[PDB]
Nucleic acid binder design. Structure first.
Length: 103
DNA sequence: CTGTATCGTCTTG
DNA sequence: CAAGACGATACAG
């Protein structure tokens, strides 16, 4: 039920975006196998240049716990304070932290 | 079993 | 009618 992007697909996605910008319908059609939502999500949350791939710092965790006390579970709002992370990363991180904290 | 990328679905633009 | 948003879920390791 999960069709995860392979490194090959990611590179193609990159090229397609370099070529067609933000025309997701058109970028998707370059795949036999992928829709607009899938490419849009993959770019926006994983491949865009601004996305951070470095592990969460202690200070980021601290900011997350602070921001949750402040905003509740409004992940997109909270993600504004994390330069290279999106709501996806912020909410995943909280599931993991709260788990290790004893939910 | 856990951590996390994807997906169902609702909401907003 | 596309894109944003969030909970749930698949699934690798």
């Amino acid at each position: 039920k999960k069709q995860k992007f392979t490194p090959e697909e990611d590179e193609m996605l990159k090229r397609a975006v370099a070529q067609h910008g933000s025309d997701w319908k058109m970028i998707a059609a370059t795949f036999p196998n992928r829709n607009a939502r899938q490419c849009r999500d993959r770019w926006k949350n994983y491949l865009a240049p601004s996305i951070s791939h470095t592990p969460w710092t202690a200070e980021e965790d601290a900011l997350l716990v602070q921001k949750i006390q402040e905003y509740g579970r409004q992940w997109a709002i909270i993600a504004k304070f994390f330069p290279g992370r999106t709501d996806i990363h912020i909410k995943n991180r909280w599931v993991t932290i709260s788990n290790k904290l004893g939910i």
